């Protein structure tokens, strides 16, 4: 009884072009003009994020192939820096980043899916929270009852994404068929212009959390990344171009929802199509994060950091059901909050320093263990380029925007108590251990689930 390998090359690019495309391209291009000052530097910034992502993600083909264990960023961290450094990450993933990343995308699914029925005013806030939760629940069920279904859903919405951007781009070239500007050079803006683009491309690091379910990883993982990440970069810079064929620079600097403006300009009888496509893009990204995160916390249980129930697979259905339920339930907590966004803007840096520590760890692992098999090897110049550029875009942008670090480090250090209680401990309180076993067997009888047989 183990997680049965089911992800093909085809579904393996669907998980990555699925999780990347998302909301970023449809609502954050305004966020680069606001710093770059010009459509000239904007087209450069949107290309520069592309190559920086490709070098990063190919540097992730090293970690991807050298360690099959598929905790992604967390497994690669545990393998190098050991239990406490990896646990503080897994605590942050568990508590903040992965639930809030699902929830805000569930909300962004709602506000754009409902917009055809609310064309010029805010959508009813309670309806938006209900439709957000309906999405996370439906995709949790669609993840429980078949991995082959969940990845066929990922395929469907990866197609929906590339239909949307194809429709944007062909209108771009139709607009060109009817027939650069003054720019800043200040590095203190260029890091912020570029960092605002890294949100859109972010997600190339996701496929790595499901490697253990991928059917031939040493081909399929490296080949999925280099298939996807160039086509992401192409449709991104052509989409970013297409907006400038239609929108005035001053319009985009104001725009609440750039893709909605582009849709309303060209398609006015039926422009609601573009809100629907950005909605359905987001729906597929919720799936991306549910699927990918449940595998992270499964790994975090079987690598012996998290409570044991999260390891237990359903033996007829072959899905790690308590981890799917746990990530669902952790997500729905965020619906019972208002505007937590300032700490989310802080933790957006934490993922990049994890990519840094992990890929620093890849060279550290190379020097300490050249004995290992490496199904692909990367020219050391590329990590050397990528690590410095990454730490630069973390450090300078953080000095410009340390948005909520007082609450940020309040949350980060709250993992250390739980490490000393849950991972370090000598298990003295025997009265608790009876409850731990009792609630465990309750969950196992209730959910009908069985541990990973190594």
């Amino acid at each position: 009884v183990t997680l049965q390998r089911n992800i093909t090359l085809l579904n393996g690019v669907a998980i990555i072009v699925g999780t990347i495309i998302g909301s970023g391209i449809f609502v954050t291009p305004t966020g680069v003009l606001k710093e770059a000052g010009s459509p000239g530097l904007a087209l450069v910034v949107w290309a520069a994020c592309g190559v920086f992502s490709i070098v990063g993600a190919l540097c992730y083909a090293e970690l991807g192939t050298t360690i099959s264990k598929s905790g992604g960023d967390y497994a690669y961290m545990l393998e190098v820096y050991g239990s406490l450094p990896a646990f503080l990450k897994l605590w942050i993933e568990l508590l903040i980043i992965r639930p809030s990343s699902q929830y805000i995308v569930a909300l962004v699914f709602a506000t754009y899916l409902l917009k055809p029925l609310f064309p010029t005013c805010p959508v009813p806030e309670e309806a938006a929270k209900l439709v957000a939760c309906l999405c996370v629940l439906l995709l949790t069920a669609v993840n429980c009852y078949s991995v082959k279904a969940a990845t066929r859903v990922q395929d469907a919405f990866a197609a929906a994404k590339l239909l949307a951007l194809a429709l944007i781009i062909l209108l771009g070239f139709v607009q060109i068929g009817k027939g650069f500007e003054g720019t800043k050079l200040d590095v203190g803006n260029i890091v912020l212009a570029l960092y605002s683009g890294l949100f859109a491309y972010g997600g190339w690091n996701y496929l790595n959390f499901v490697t253990e379910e991928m059917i031939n990883p040493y081909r399929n993982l490296p080949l999925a990344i280099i298939i996807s990440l160039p086509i992401v970069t192409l449709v991104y810079v052509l989409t970013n171009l297409a907006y400038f064929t239609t929108l005035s620079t001053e319009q985009m600097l104001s725009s609440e929802a750039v893709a909605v403006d582009f849709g309303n300009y060209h398609l006015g009888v039926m422009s609601w199509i573009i809100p629907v496509f950005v909605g359905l893009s987001c729906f597929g990204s919720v799936n991306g994060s549910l699927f990918t995160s449940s595998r992270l916390f499964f790994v975090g249980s079987r690598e012996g950091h998290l409570p044991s129930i999260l390891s237990m697979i359903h033996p007829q259905l072959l899905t790690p059901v308590p981890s799917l339920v746990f990530t669902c339930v952790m997500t729905l907590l965020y619906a019972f909050s208002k505007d937590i966004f300032s700490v989310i803007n802080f933790f957006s840096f934490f993922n990049w320093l994890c990519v840094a520590l992990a890929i620093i760890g890849m060279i550290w692992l190379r020097h300490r263990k050249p004995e290992l098999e490496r199904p692909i090897k990367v020219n050391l110049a590329l990590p050397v380029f990528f690590i410095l550029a990454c730490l630069f875009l973390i450090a300078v942008s953080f000095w410009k925007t340390p948005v909520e670090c007082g609450i940020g480090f309040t949350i980060i250090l709250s993992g250390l108590p739980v490490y000393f209680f849950g991972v370090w401990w000598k298990n003295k309180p025997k009265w608790l251990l009876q409850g731990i076993f009792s609630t465990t067997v309750l969950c196992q009888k209730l959910m009908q689930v069985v541990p990973q047989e190594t």
Binding site: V1, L114, L117, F118, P119, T120, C121, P124, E126, A127, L130, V131, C133, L134, L137, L138, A141, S308, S311, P315, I436, F437, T440, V441, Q444, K445, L446, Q448, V450, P451, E453
Partner: protein
């Protein structure tokens, strides 16, 4: 703390538990179409935008 498949499957097939799972995994699916009915009611009850 692993616990055995062949231990669990002595209890996990019992009538009370298989009835309990059918009850809960129906109540959940009823709860979800309850979310949908609730949302559709709110969307119909809410006053639509001003005309431009």
């Amino acid at each position: 703390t692993g616990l055995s498949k062949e231990e669990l499957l002595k209890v996990a097939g019992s009538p009370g538990w298989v009835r309990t799972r059918w009850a809960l995994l129906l109540l959940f699916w009823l709860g979800w179409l309850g979310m949908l009915a609730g949302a559709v009611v709110i969307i119909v009850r809410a006053p639509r935008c001003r005309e431009l």
